[PDB]
Design a protein around this ligand. Structure first.
Ligand SMILES: CCCCCCCCCCCCCCCCCC(=O)OC[C@H](CO[C@@H]1O[C@H](CO[C@H]2O[C@H](CO)[C@H](O)[C@H](O)[C@H]2O)[C@H](O)[C@H](O)[C@H]1O)OC(=O)CCCCCCCCCCCCCCCCC
Ligand SMILES: CCCCCCCCCCCCCCCCCC(=O)OC[C@H](CO[C@@H]1O[C@H](CO[C@H]2O[C@H](CO)[C@H](O)[C@H](O)[C@H]2O)[C@H](O)[C@H](O)[C@H]1O)OC(=O)CCCCCCCCCCCCCCCCC
Ligand code: CLA
Ligand code: CLA
Ligand code: CLA
Ligand code: CLA
Ligand SMILES: CCCCCCCCCCCCCCCC(=O)OC[C@H](COP(=O)(O)OC[C@@H](O)CO)OC(=O)CCCCCCCCCCCCCCC
Ligand SMILES: CC1=C(/C=C/C(C)=C/C=C/C(C)=C/C=C/C=C(C)/C=C/C=C(C)/C=C/C2=C(C)CCCC2(C)C)C(C)(C)CCC1
Ligand SMILES: CC1=C(/C=C/C(C)=C/C=C/C(C)=C/C=C/C=C(C)/C=C/C=C(C)/C=C/C2=C(C)CCCC2(C)C)C(C)(C)CCC1
Ligand SMILES: CC1=C(/C=C/C(C)=C/C=C/C(C)=C/C=C/C=C(C)/C=C/C=C(C)/C=C/C2=C(C)CCCC2(C)C)C(C)(C)CCC1
Ligand SMILES: CCCCCCCCCCCCO[C@@H]1O[C@H](CO)[C@@H](O[C@H]2O[C@H](CO)[C@@H](O)[C@H](O)[C@H]2O)[C@H](O)[C@H]1O
Ligand SMILES: CCCCCCCCCCCCO[C@@H]1O[C@H](CO)[C@@H](O[C@H]2O[C@H](CO)[C@@H](O)[C@H](O)[C@H]2O)[C@H](O)[C@H]1O
Ligand SMILES: [Ca+2]
Ligand SMILES: [Cl-]
Ligand SMILES: [Cl-]
Ligand SMILES: [Fe+2]
Lengths: 334, 78, 450, 135, 34, 35, 341
């Protein structure tokens, strides 16, 4: 009846083609702002002094980049963790020089993806669903917050956040390895277990379901037309898939309950990505990967190398050349 | 459900099984222990002991460079 | 009291969910877990004392509880030197014995008490739907929390004081005689930006500010406790919130996640409530120490540190912050908001003063900077100090690093717990936590999206 | 090879005197080096001042030369500058100032002897001893 | 080599203990399959 | 009732587990090798 | 009863461990490969091939052990135990790195036997062989990485070592020497693997949160039986949810599961094509337009050129230790390094 209640009913409506909700009332402005500023900056931002040493890095397409090398360059190291909106700049050109677009895009994007997770819960509540899809989405959200927010906070500068580009991401990863030895960190190893196993189990699940499809089509048409949207019955024989997979390994290694199988399919890469998000978030505070350098000595005391020592030689080569003009003192304290 | 074999939970909860294994599993453990502690593993696999990584006449890495006569090469490397 | 899944509908891996409507057993689980917390406090303090070299810095020895006891002003003197081993041992012994008492009480309520307390007393009997009794328990816990804040205030004001790292003559255990009761300062700490140079409440820089805030927190908590004991929840609160045990758990999980994040940032950035004599330098402190150390060394070699330009054109040792303050050069330009008791003597109104740098640097500041630079919070998981490219000979990870990493991980997983329990509480109060009813599936009655 | 006596034989003074450490003395000197020296002298460098490192050429170029046991012991009692002109008792860790360096007030004279012996033996076990910070 | 003797002999003790505690049923299973 | 003892499953278990326990005892003795 | 059909009966019994005709290839080869890896990482050095300690016997841990690649002097010699290098000596064979082609060859033939096992059990059970088709991805990865990459290079030395930190070395080596992150074939591999992980997580979460209320317990896992006919979760509700959240949604179960198959298998095949290119040093190392500009203009810096500098530094600081057979003496003054580090 009231205007506010009519607005509340429109906002929370399940009949909206794209669900808005109250989390969407924050999601849509922040994500549209971040999208518009990212597109404009990726095409036409001027070079950005990321290291705060008056050495501006061309990040945009109009300044000589391609798609692979293009990036929205992180804000200046001179700024650090300081809040740098447009109204704190004396001009828009100064804001562009110091990397203000990165701060704007990253802050609105982080709010938007947290509101995406809230909106996923919201729509699951309005649809009468169980609510934990947002918990699975909290693993990419945690990883994004680790590389765009938590690593800058721990390192003390938004210039340390992952750049918004392909080659910028590669640069972030290589400097990360040289400084934190992320490959030797077990949380990253758990993340690699998560993504390799998630892809493995995606291939397994998909291959077993495709293998055990019930014959409902001819050999001419696509087999996907054997499934009708909203059909009551099962489109594949789970018992046949279980018989195959419990003969492929052994009987008790195969799921027969589809709900336990799908909980495992959800839980494995989510827990792996949670662990790798926490690994990056803890190397924000410089709790680094394992240091086994010169761990093996002979009886005289001479160092016998291992593969970790060769890995350290690679890490040193990455470190001495990174931000080549930014260091004035002997130690890269942060 | 059962393919024919005795179920494992029946097997490992038996007196006769643990009478056999209380002996077999620790004595395999001590067999591996005496493989290492008598030093036979070094001679079997050619792994240097902690004082034969470098000799008094070779202090560099003994990187094999021969393609066929590697036995004499390892010998003069010691 | 169902102790199996046919009698409860909860599997063993969700088995403590069988305790939701069993109040006395639930009280026993809590008291038993509380006893675990006090047990760790006592046994870890005894371990840290047993693994304490008192002539060695606490941050060098992997200690996290002895710094907390020393910050309160127990067993320490000027510059954090341990005068007495005994107060740390006393704090450990007291927690360990109280934990024995609490474990006996938790095991009693969990295994022999009334399973439900509502058939024994109306005071301890709680129904989750009973909004008045849950607000009474809020009020009790609020009164005792305010008393704990006032107990910290009493320790700092009337019981020997606390460790002030900013004290003249160097940091020492001093008595706070003039805490700031000004609500402008205390609550404008809450309005400061959570960003660089402002730091929200992490930038609280003096023991007077901390103690005045704790007086305000104690007053606020006691007033709010008397509030929740004297009032029922209002209609807006009843219409906005879910009123169930899982809901209240998830609300507390969200608060705990917030507090773990804040504690990680607090131990990473603040050196007032986490003094660097006990917790080691912060990352910002160590970087500024490296810049100051090499400024001092190159000035002793005759270099003009003001007019020295670096390879990039900025000053090698001294430069300007984006607002113009004279700050250390190099990558530490990002840490220019760092304040520390070894560095504030060399800071003028415009930043780092040239005259003080030229002729007022003391040898203890040089020693402190070298120690802090060589104890930067950088370390491998296996506790190998320094940058990760260093070889294995320095057994060090800063307590700041351990505490910040642990509490950030705990804060994240407790945000995950909030999401899991807030969603399940809403789904269970709405009635679809077990899945979609086939006959009344809600999407089947909606119009098509296109 | 083993940790031979030739590895433990090091110059004792400036006059050609030599001393041979024991295995226990070398182990104790290493342990003391891990405990107190490595925070600035990891792998023989000096993070605070790598112009003055623990390399053997660095030790030989000091005034007087610090490539022998008694010179390193004297530096650990009364540290000086590299040219021996200035006083570093308030700036380098030492055993004569327990007021400002309490981490070494429980070290005896034999402990200083052991850590000096390790400081002379460790350069011939690592070729990157006393190099650049990143080496 | 005495090393070979003292390495093989624990395996011999394990095998002979398993044999003298399973051999009746082992010979029975061998008989029932011919 | 009256199961076989020696099966393909028995050999499948030992082929893996007998050298596994042997190798574990080896690595346990390796833990006490001094430099 | 013919002897072949009697053997076919015995090989394809319903036992705890299925053998099959494929088991005669799979089980001895997989056992040889696994036992060789465990034997090498427990006992066998890399001191004469690499100048490294890589067994538990030398004091390395689980991260730092490997069956390391053989010496570069052997080229692509298959390094048989009876071969002209080892000459029957097992100790010499262990020392020259013959366990690497032992593990790699038996592993490759065991992988063949495993996909043959997938084919055999799929035929016996009566299902389609899409598990074997999906497993073509891992075999493509193994063949391109452990076999055709060293075959294209100078020796088996530059193959990845069968170890955790050895694989990390191979990974960093391919970054610094090949710019393998910049290769689009690896980017498609990354997209496929992260998409497969995404699809796994999203598919599991969607099914667990669109389950039908088919039981009275809060434990929803007991509301399923394998022999039931109807779906355990609501595809209509899931479709409406993802249509309103994401914009699009799956409407076909079979297409959903084929896509869950398709994404990581295609990623593995694409990354394998890139590794085949890298075998011949056919890299996507450089964008020549940006180097020509950067050589002409010292004001031009992108993240690409920074990565190029990172690769140069890694190569110069790693190659003397990573390739000790080359005797790379790089004096300290030629090592590229930035200011003060
Ligand atoms: C619903 C709630 C919505 C709330 C929204 C409000 C924003 C929340 C997020 C804040 C993000 C801030 C970005 C910049 C952070 C920063 O510059 O730094 C952190 C700041 C602290 O600021 C620092 O504070 C310092 C204060 O120390 C000063 O004072 C000290 C006194 O001892 C010392 O003297 C010290 O040397 C001196 O510098 C300095 O001022 C620094 O310059 C300044 O940067 O944190 C703080 O204020 C408070 C802590 C912030 C939150 C911590 C992150 C939580 C992340 C969770 C991620 C979850 C993911 C889940 C996924 C699923
Ligand atoms: C599908 C899935 C099923 C999976 C199956 C897995 C099991 C596979 C079983 C086979 C394994 C292949 C072993 C290949 C051995 C090999 O290659 O060994 C290599 C030899 C050639 O030897 C090499 O030859 C080189 C060139 O030498 C020549 O040049 C030199 C310099 O001038 C000298 O003059 C020298 O004397 C002269 O011979 C160098 O000498 C090398 O050191 C030496 O190792 O070829 C040969 O045996 C035979 C060459 C022809 C057949 C090649 C088949 C393999 C294809 C390789 C593709 C190569 C490159 C593309 C990469 C991408
Ligand atoms: C902090 C950890 C903690 C605590 C305090 C509890 C507490 C409780 N759980 Mg529980 N649980 C936990 C972790 C915990 N759990 C974990 C990690 C799991 C997953 C495996 C479970 C799964 C679970 C299930 C399935 C159930 C419970 C149940 C219970 C309740 C009664 C237990 C009972 O009756 O059987 C008694 C058990 C014993 C008598 C075994 C002996 C154990 C004793 C108590 C050991 C501790 C004694 C200590 C050494 C002595 C110190 C005392 C002093 C002298 C110093 C109880 C309040 C039950 C319930 O819901 O109640 C209706 C139940 O069904 N839990
Ligand atoms: C949060 C903790 C907590 C809570 C809410 C309860 C609640 C209850 N207990 Mg329990 N108990 C606890 C912890 C707790 N207990 C611990 C730690 C022990 C070990 C000593 C016990 C051992 C215990 C036994 C043996 C019995 C109970 C009983 C009871 C019930 C009636 C008590 C009563 O009203 O008498 C009146 C209350 C008073 C006279 C208040 C006296 C003040 C207290 C005891 C001293 C002050 C505490 C401390 C010094 C102050 C600060 C705490 C410190 C750790 C900081 C009641 C529901 C009885 C029962 O089972 O019900 C039928 C029963 O016989 N409890
Ligand atoms: C931890 C102790 C505690 C707990 C569990 C509660 C719990 C509760 N209080 Mg209480 N309160 C407390 C302490 C506590 N209070 C104290 C210490 C005081 C003294 C100041 C009060 C004074 C108080 C009053 C006057 C009222 C309550 C009310 C309530 C009820 C509903 C509140 C609500 O909906 O939240 C949510 C709040 C909102 C939706 C309002 C918007 C607030 C914005 C979003 C906060 C912004 C915070 C920001 C994101 C974080 C930045 C930090 C800083 C800048 C603020 C609830 C049961 C209400 C009630 O029901 O009466 C009985 C009520 O009117 N409390
Ligand atoms: C104090 C806060 C708190 C409390 C009281 C609860 C309480 C409850 N939770 Mg919750 N939850 C929390 C925080 C909390 N949770 C957090 C922080 C998370 C995110 C991880 C979750 C995620 C969660 C899930 C997914 C579920 C619950 C569930 C439950 C219910 C039953 C759980 C149970 O029986 O324990 C059983 C304990 C175990 C089975 C063992 C857990 C051990 C974990 C996996 C590893 C331990 C790691 C630890 C750091 C030690 C490392 C060991 C290592 C060295 C080997 C119960 C009422 C269930 C539910 O919804 O029912 C209503 C359920 O499904 N919770
Ligand atoms: C007690 C452990 C809880 C830790 C949280 C991790 C489990 C949840 C992760 C799933 C995320 C995806 C969300 C959508 C997925 C989703 O919606 O799940 C649905 C699934 C169905 O549960 P039910 O509704 O039947 O029961 C759960 C509650 O409703 C009441 O029991 O929930 C669970 O299975 C929870 C069981 C977790 C308890 C055991 C899990 C232990 C795994 C972690 C062990 C440690 C791993 C690291 C070791 C190296
Ligand atoms: C319910 C339940 C549970 C739980 C339980 C718990 C949680 C508990 C606890 C408990 C506790 C919480 C405890 C405790 C304790 C303590 C004690 C018992 C102590 C003591 C003492 C002493 C004796 C000491 C001594 C000493 C001193 C005096 C000092 C010096 C040193 C020493 C140490 C000698 C579970 C999970 C199992 C499950 C089932 C049910
Ligand atoms: C001690 C101290 C201090 C003080 C502090 C203070 C004084 C404080 C406070 C504080 C406070 C006083 C706070 C707070 C908070 C709040 C919160 C955290 C909230 C919230 C929220 C919520 C939870 C809500 C929700 C919702 C919404 C959003 C809407 C609808 C409904 C609902 C409910 C859903 C200082 C720093 C000075 C100094 C140092 C120390
Ligand atoms: C090379 C070769 C060969 C072969 C051999 C073989 C085939 C053998 C073997 C072997 C084997 C087959 C061995 C084994 C092993 C093992 C081990 C070394 C194990 C382990 C383990 C562990 C350590 C685990 C742990 C854990 C975890 C981590 C998880 C859960 C829990 C537990 C604790 C269980 C022949 C003579 C033909 C000729 C020449 C060449
Ligand atoms: C700070 C918040 C101050 C409280 C403001 C609300 C006071 C209103 C008193 O009224 C209370 O709440 C609502 C009005 O919304 C009524 O509905 C409830 O029956 C009553 O308990
Ligand atoms: C976990 C698996 C265990 C690994 C196996 C343990 C035994 C390893 C080998 C050690 C045995 C003796 O070690 C070495 O064996 C080889 C056989 O390979 C002998 O070699 C001898 O026979 C071979 C075979 O014709 C020829 O090379 C030659 O005639 C002669 O050298 C060596 O003289 C001996 O030094
Ligand atoms: Ca020290
Ligand atoms: Cl760079
Ligand atoms: Cl610097
Ligand atoms: Fe599925």
């Amino acid at each position: 009846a009231s205007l506010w209640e009519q607005f509340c009913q429109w906002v929370t409506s399940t009949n909206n083609r794209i669900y808005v909700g109250w989390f969407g009332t924050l999601m849509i402005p922040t994500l549209l702002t971040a999208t518009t500023c990212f597109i404009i900056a990726f095409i036409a931002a001027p070079p950005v002094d990321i290291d705060g040493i008056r050495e501006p890095v061309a990040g945009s397409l109009l300044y000589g980049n391609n798609i692979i090398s293009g990036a929205v360059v992180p804000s200046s190291n001179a700024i650090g963790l300081h809040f740098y909106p447009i109204w704190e700049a004396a001009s828009l050109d100064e804001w562009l020089y110091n990397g203000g677009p990165y701060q704007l895009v990253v802050f609105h994007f982080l709010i938007g993806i947290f509101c995406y997770m809230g909106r996923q819960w919201e729509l699951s509540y309005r649809l009468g669903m169980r609510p934990w899809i947002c918990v699975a989405y909290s693993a990419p959200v945690s990883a994004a917050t680790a590389v765009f927010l938590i690593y800058p906070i721990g390192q003390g500068s938004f210039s340390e956040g992952m750049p918004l580009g392909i080659s910028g991401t590669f640069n972030f990863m290589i400097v990360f390895q040289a400084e934190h030895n992320i490959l030797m960190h077990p949380f990253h190893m758990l993340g690699v277990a998560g993504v390799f196993g998630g892809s493995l189990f995606s291939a397994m699940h998909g291959s077993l379901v495709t293998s055990s499809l019930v014959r409902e089509t001819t050999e001419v048409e696509s087999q996907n037309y054997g499934y009708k949207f909203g059909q009551e019955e099962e489109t594949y024989n789970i018992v046949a898939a279980h018989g195959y997979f419990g003969r492929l390994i052994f009987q008790y290694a195969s799921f027969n309950n589809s709900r336990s199988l799908h909980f495992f399919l959800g839980a494995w890469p989510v827990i792996g990505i949670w662990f790798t998000a926490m690994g990056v978030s803890t190397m924000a505070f410089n709790l680094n990967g394992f240091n086994f350098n010169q761990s093996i000595l002979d009886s005289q005391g001479r160092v016998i190398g291992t593969w970790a020592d060769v890995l350290n030689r690679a890490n040193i080569g990455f470190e001495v050349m990174h931000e080549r003009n930014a260091h004035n003192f002997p130690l890269d304290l942060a | 459900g059962t393919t024919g074999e005795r179920p494992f939970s029946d097997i490992v909860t038996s007196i006769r099984y643990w009478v056999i294994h209380s002996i077999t599993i620790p004595m395999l453990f001590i067999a591996g222990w005496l493989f290492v502690s008598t030093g036979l593993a070094y001679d079997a696999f050619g792994t240097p002991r902690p004082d034969e990584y470098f000799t008094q006449t070779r202090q560099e890495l003994p990187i094999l460079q021969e393609r066929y006569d590697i036995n004499q090469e390892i010998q003069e490397f010691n | 009291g169902g102790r199996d899944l046919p009698s409860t509908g909860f599997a063993w891996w969700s088995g403590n969910a069988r305790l939701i409507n069993l109040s006395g057993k639930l009280l026993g689980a809590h008291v038993a877990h509380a006893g675990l917390i006090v047990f760790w406090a006592g046994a870890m303090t005894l371990f840290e004392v047993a693994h304490f070299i008192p002539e060695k810095p606490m941050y060098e020895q992997g200690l996290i509880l002895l710094p907390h006891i020393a910050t309160l002003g127990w067993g320490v003197g000027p510059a954090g030197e341990v005068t007495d081993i005994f107060p740390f041992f006393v704090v450990g012994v007291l927690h360990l014995i109280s934990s024995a008492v609490l474990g006996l009480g938790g095991i009693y309520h969990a295994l022999r008490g009334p399973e439900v307390l509502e058939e024994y007393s109306s005071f301890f009997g709680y129904d989750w739907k009973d909004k008045n009794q849950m607000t009474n328990i809020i009020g009790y816990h609020l009164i005792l929390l305010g008393c704990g804040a006032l107990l910290l205030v009493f320790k700092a004001m009337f019981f020997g004081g606390v460790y002030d790292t900013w004290a003249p003559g160097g940091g020492d255990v001093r008595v706070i005689t003039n805490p700031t009761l000004n609500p402008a300062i205390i609550f404008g700490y809450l309005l400061k930006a959570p960003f660089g140079g402002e730091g929200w409440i992490i930038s609280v820089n003096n023991m007077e500010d901390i103690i005045g805030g704790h007086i305000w927190i104690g007053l606020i908590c006691i007033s709010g406790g008397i509030w929740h004991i004297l009032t029922k929840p209002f209609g807006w609160a009843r219409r906005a919130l879910i009123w169930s045990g899982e809901a209240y758990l998830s609300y507390s999980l969200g608060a705990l996640s917030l507090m773990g994040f804040i504690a990680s940032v607090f131990v990473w950035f603040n050196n007032t409530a986490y003094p660097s004599e006990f917790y080691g330098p912060t990352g910002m402190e160590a970087s500024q120490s490296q810049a100051f150390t090499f400024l001092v060394r190159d000035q002793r070699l005759g270099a003009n540190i003001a007019s020295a330009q670096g390879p990039t054109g900025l000053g090698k040792y001294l430069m300007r912050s984006p607002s113009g303050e004279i700050i250390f050069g190099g990558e530490t330009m990002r840490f220019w908001d760092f304040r520390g008791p070894w560095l504030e003597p060399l800071r003028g109104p415009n930043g780092l003063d040239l005259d003080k740098l030229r002729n007022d640097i003391q040898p203890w500041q040089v020693r402190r900077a070298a120690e802090y630079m060589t104890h930067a919070p950088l370390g491998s998981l296996n506790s190998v100090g320094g940058v990760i490219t260093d070889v294995n000979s320095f057994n060090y990870v800063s307590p700041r690093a351990w505490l910040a990493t642990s509490h950030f991980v705990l804060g994240f997983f407790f945000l995950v717990g909030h999401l899991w329990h807030a969603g399940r509480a809403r789904a269970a109060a709405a009635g679809f936590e077990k899945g979609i009813d086939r006959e009344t599936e809600p999407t089947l009655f909606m119009p098509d999206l296109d | 090879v083993e940790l031979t006596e030739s590895t433990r034989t090091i110059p004792l003074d400036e006059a050609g005197g030599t001393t041979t450490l024991t295995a226990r003395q070398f182990t104790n000197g290493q342990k003391i080096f891990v405990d107190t020296c490595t925070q600035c002298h990891l792998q023989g460098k000096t993070k605070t001042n790598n112009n003055v490192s623990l390399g053997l050429a660095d030790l030989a170029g000091a005034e007087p030369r610090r490539d022998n046991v008694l010179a390193l012991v004297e530096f650990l009692k009364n540290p000086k500058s590299y040219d021996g002109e200035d006083d570093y008792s308030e700036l380098h860790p030492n055993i004569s100032r327990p007021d400002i360096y309490p981490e070494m007030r429980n070290y005896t004279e034999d402990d200083i002897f052991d850590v000096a012996g390790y400081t002379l033996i460790a350069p011939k076990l690592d070729e990157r001893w006393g190099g650049t910070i990143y080496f | 080599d005495w090393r070979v003797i003292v390495v093989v002999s624990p395996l011999l003790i394990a095998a002979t203990w398993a044999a003298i505690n399973i051999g009746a049923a082992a010979i029975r299973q061998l008989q029932d399959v011919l | 009732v009256t199961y076989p003892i020696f099966t393909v499953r028995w050999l499948a278990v030992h082929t893996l587990a007998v050298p596994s326990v042997f190798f574990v005892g080896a690595i346990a003795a390796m833990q006490f090798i001094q430099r | 009863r013919g002897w072949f059909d009697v053997l076919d009966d015995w090989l394809k019994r319903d036992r705890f461990v299925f053998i099959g005709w494929s088991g005669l290839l799979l089980f001895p080869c997989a056992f040889m490969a696994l036992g060789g890896w465990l034997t090498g990482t427990t006992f066998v050095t890399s001191w004469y091939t690499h100048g490294l300690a890589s067994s538990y016997l030398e004091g390395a841990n689980f991260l730092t052990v490997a069956v390391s690649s053989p010496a570069d002097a052997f080229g692509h010699s298959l390094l048989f135990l009876w071969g002209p290098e080892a000459q029957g000596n097992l100790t010499r064979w262990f020392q020259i790195g013959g366990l690497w082609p032992f593990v790699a060859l038996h592993g490759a033939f065991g992988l063949i036997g495993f996909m043959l096992r997938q084919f055999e059990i799929s035929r016996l059970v009566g299902i389609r062989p899409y598990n074997a088709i999906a497993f073509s991805g891992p075999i493509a990865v193994f063949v391109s990485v452990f076999l055709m990459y060293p075959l294209g290079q100078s020796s088996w030395f530059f193959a990845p070592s069968f170890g955790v930190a050895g694989i990390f070395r191979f990974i960093l080596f391919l970054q610094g020497f090949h710019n393998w992150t910049l290769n689009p074939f690896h980017m498609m591999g990354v997209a496929g693997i992260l998409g497969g992980a995404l699809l796994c997580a999203i598919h599991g979460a969607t099914v667990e949160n669109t389950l039908f209320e088919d039981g009275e317990d809060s434990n929803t896992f007991r509301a399923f039986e394998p022999t039931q006919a109807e779906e355990t979760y609501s595809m209509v509700t899931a479709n409406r949810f993802w249509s309103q959240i994401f914009g699009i949604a799956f409407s076909n179960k079979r297409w959903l599961h084929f896509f869950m198959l398709f994404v990581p298998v295609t990623g593995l095949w694409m990354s394998s094509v890139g590794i085949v290119g890298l075998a011949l040093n056919l890299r996507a190392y450089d964008f020549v337009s940006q180097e020509l500009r950067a050589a002409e203009d010292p004001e031009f810096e992108t993240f690409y050129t920074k990565n190029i500098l990172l690769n140069e530094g890694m190569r110069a600081w790693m190659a003397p230790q990573d390739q000790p057979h080359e005797n790379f003496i790089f004096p300290e003054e030629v090592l590229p390094r930035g200011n003060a580090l």
